[PDB]
Amino acid sequence: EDLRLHLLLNTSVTCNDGSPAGYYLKESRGSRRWLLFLEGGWYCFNRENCDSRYDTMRRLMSSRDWPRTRTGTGILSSQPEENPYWWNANMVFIPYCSSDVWSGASSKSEKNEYAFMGALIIQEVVRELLGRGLSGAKVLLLAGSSAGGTGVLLNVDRVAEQLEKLGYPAIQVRGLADSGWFLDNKQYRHTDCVDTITCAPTEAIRRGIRYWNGVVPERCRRQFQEGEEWNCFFGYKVYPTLRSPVFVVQWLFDEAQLTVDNVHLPVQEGLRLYIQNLGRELRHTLKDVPASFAPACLSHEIIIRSHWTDVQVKGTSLPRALHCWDRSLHPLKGCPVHLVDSCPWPHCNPSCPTG
Template sequence: MQRLAVRSCMLLLLVHLCAPGQVKRARGRGAQSRRVQQQAPAYTERVEGTESFPLDFTAVEGNMDNFMVQIKNLAQSLYPCSAQKLDQDMKLHFLKNESVICNDGSPAGYYLKQSKGSKRWLVFLEGGWYCFNRQTCNSRYETMRRLMSSTKWPASRTGTGILSPQPEENPHWWNANMVFIPYCSSDVWSGATPKSGHGDYAFMGSLIIQEVINELLTKGLNNAKVLLLAGSSAGGTGVLLNVDHVSEQLKVQGHTGVQVRGLADSGWFLDNKQYKFTDCLDTISCAPTEAIKRGVRYWGTQVPENCRQAHLGEEWNCFFGYKVFPTLNSPVFVVQWLFDEAQLTVDNVHLTGQPVHEGQWRYIQSLGQELRGTLQDVPAIFSPACLSHELITRTNWLEIQVKGTSLPRALHCWDRSLQDNTNVSHGNHSTLKQRTPLRGCPVHLVDSCPWPHCNPTCPTIRDQLTGQEMSVIQFLKHMGFDVQKMAQQQGMDPRKLLGMLNNGS
C-alpha cells in the first residue's frame, strides 16, 4: 500500500504542475484524493520544471487491477487539462535500413508507442495468409496490396486487446512499450530474399523483424527486462519461426538481460489431410503442406536452427507448430482455437449458409481431437473449443474463458511462473514441463468438450446468410448435429443432452 501511495503522489504532482489552479478546485472530490494531495508537498522539491518522469509500475503487478482503477479515477478527477492529453496511438516509423523492404520494394516499418519507465516490450507480428509463387503473389497484390506494400499505411494505429493502452481492456500489459509490425512480406515472416528485378517480389519477413529489433535497441529495448514477441495467424506462426532468432540476436549484441518470450495466436496449423483434395491453384484451397513446400523455395526461408537440423532438406516441417515447438529454446505461450476457421478453410471445409452433412461434421470433430492431441505437451496453452480465428487483439478477449480462466489471467500466471522460477533456465522446455504450476494460477488450459462452441464463453455465432445471432443449439443443428443420435450414442436422455449443451457442459 505504501508503494501505491507513493506512485499516486507522483502522479498527482505531475498533474499539479500541469494545471495548479485546476487541481486546487478539484480538492474535496473524494477522501482518497484528499489523502494523496496532503502527501504531495513532501515530493515537491524532488521535481524540477514541468517535465514528465518515468514511472515503473511493474513492481505492483501483483495487485495491478486495483492499482489501475485508483490511478485512472485519480487522473480523471484531477487532470482537466484535456488539451495536453497524451496520445495513446502507435506511430509509424519506416526502417532506416532502406535495403529491408516490403514485397513491392516500398520501405518496411513498424508502429511504436513507448511507455517511459516500463521495462517490458511487446512486439506484435500481423497476420494475413501468404502467397507462394508469381501467380498467387500477383493476385494478392491486386486484391490485398496493403499486405505487400507500405505505400498506403496510416500514420498511426490504435492498439486493441493485448496492444491496448487501456488497463480495463488489457489489465497486465497495458503499460508495456507497444510495437506493431505490419505484415508486408507474404512469407509467414520467414523470408530473406531481396527484390531481384522489375516485376519480382522481395520476401524479407525474417529480416524485417531483425531490423526492427535493431532499431528498438536504440529506443530503450536495450534496458528491457522482458521482450514478448507476439503474433496472430501467419504472425503466430512467425513467432514460432523467429522467437529463437530474436533471442540469439540480443545475446550476440550483448543484451543478455532481456528475457525473450513468445505468444503464438492462431498459428498452430496442422499438416493434415484435406477434407476434399484440390489442385494447388490458389492460396485458399491449396493444402498447407503443398503451399508451404512451394513457399519455402520461393521465399528463401530461414527457420530456427534446431528445427532445420531436425528436418534437413524438409525445412517446411518447421512451419507446423507441433513440429517446431519441441525444438525451441525460448518459452512460448500458445493460443489456439480447437476449431480454427483458417485451418478448416485450407482443409476445404467451407461453412457457408447450408448445413454441413455428416461427413463434414465427423471431419470437424476429428480435427479438434487431432489438434488437442498435439497440445498435450505444451506447458502454456489456452485452447477454447470454439469455431473462430485470432484472439489476442480482440477488444473482448477478456470474455473468453477455458475452465473459468481468461486468457489475460493465464498470461499473467505464465509471467509469474517465469519470474518466480528464476533458478530455472527460461529456455529449457523439458525443465518447464517438470515444474509445478503456481497454485490457483493455471497455464495449461485446453477444453475437453468435443464439438464447436461447447464452451459457453465462445464468441457470438451469426448465421452467414442472415447475420442473425444463433444459439448454441441452433448452431449445432446448422452444423448437422443430431441431438437424438448423439444422445443415443452417449446413452442419455436427449433432454439432458440439450441441457448440457445449453450450459456448455
C-alpha cells in the same frame, strides 16, 4: 490513435514491392516490458498469386499507403480495462508486408519481382528499437496472430540469439503464438495442388520457401533437412525444438484450419466425425505444451481483438492465463497456464465469441 509509425532506417529491409518496412510504436517510459506483435494475413507463393494479392491486399505488400498511426487494441491496448495483462508495456505493432509467414530473406532484384524479407524485418525492427529503449528491457514478448503466430514460432529463438550476440543477454525473449498452430492433416475434401485454391498448405509452403528464400529455426532445420523445411511451419513440429518460452493460443476449430481442410459451414456423420477428430488432434498436439489456451470454438485470432478478455477456459480468461505465465517465469494455486478445452464440438464452451 496511439502507436506511431516509424519506417525502417535501413531502407534495404523492404516490403514485397521494395517500399521500406516499418513498425508502429507506443513507448511506456519506465516500463521494461516490450511487446512486439506480428500482424497476420495468409501469404502468397508464386508470381500469379502474389500479383493478385498486390491488387487487392496491397497494404500487406507495401508501406506506401500505411497511416501514420494505429490504435492499439486487445493486448496492444494501453488501457487496463481492455488489457488486464500488459497495459503498461511498450507496444510495437509490426505490419505484415512480406507475405512469407515472416520467414523470408530475399530482396527484390533482377531475378525477383518481389522481396520476401519477413525474417529480416523482425531483426531490423529489434535492432532499431534497441536505440529507442529496448536496450533497457527485461522481457521482450514476441507475439503474433495467424501467419504472425506462426512467425513467432519461426523467429522467437532467432530474436533471442540476436540479442545475445548484440550483448544483451539479460533481455528475456518469450513468444506468444495466436492462431498460428496448424495441422498438416488430410483435407475433408481433397484437391491436388493445381492452382492457388487447390494447393494445400504443405505444398504451398514447400513452394513458398523456395520462392521466398524462407528460413526456419536452426534446430528444426537440422532435424528435417534440405527440402523438408516446410515441416517447421507446423507448430507441433517446430515447438519442441525451441528454447524460448512460448505460450500457444489456438482455437480448437480454427476457421483458417477448416478453410485449408476444405470445410465451410445440418452436419452429417462424415463431417461431424471430421470436425470432432480435428479438435481431438489439436488437443493431442497441445497435451505437453505447458503454456497454452485452446478454447473449443469456431473462430480465428484473439489477442488484438478488443473483447479478447471475454473467452474463458475452465473459468480462466486469456489475460489471466498470460499473467499466470509471467508469474510462472519469475504450479501456482488458482493461476493456471495450461488451459485446453475437452468438450468436443464448436461453442461447447459458452464463452466462445458470438460472431
